[PDB]
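quick one: zinc ion bound model?
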Amino acid sequence: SVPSQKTYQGSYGFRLGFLHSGTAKSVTCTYSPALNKMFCQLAKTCPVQLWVDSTPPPGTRFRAMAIYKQSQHMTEVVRRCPHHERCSDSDGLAPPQHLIRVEGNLRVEYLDDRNTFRHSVVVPYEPPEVGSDCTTIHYNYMCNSSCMGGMNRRPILTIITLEDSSGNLLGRNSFEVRVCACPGRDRRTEEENL
Ligand SMILES: [Zn+2]
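yep, here:
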């Protein structure tokens, strides 16, 4: 039981885009093109852009789900550590076990899969303003990569699926995530190896 991570642009040319924030110490979120990897801080805004070549149907939704990047951990459900699950950081919408939240959207929906037990967060797709190129969603990651009892220093991927009103697959993309105290420093360091 592991969700597919195969990239699939689909009929609407579904792609992800990210801000070009750089690696100065003050950045709270930064994306590495070379590593296809997002470096972000705990509970801080994480902008992800949805790009499409054609506007998807009314009722289209997009879903985010985390899985472990390493094959020997892939079947394990990614969830918050007991400490953070018990933290008083609720937004009144997200379940306490869920790693990924959506910020600033009251139509957000959260799922515990009854069969796979996977967590995911789903949101109604809205097309960009006519003068805009893409739709920006603000995610929050509610555990650090280094959380004891949670991700436990294990790398994760976030999978974003585009789906129709019936939940049929329309598109898929993914990116690796590290949730850390110093995204800029950590990105610059990880790219040093290239
Ligand atoms: Zn944690």
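Residues 1-194 form a domain with the Immunoglobulin-like fold (CATH 2.60.40.720).
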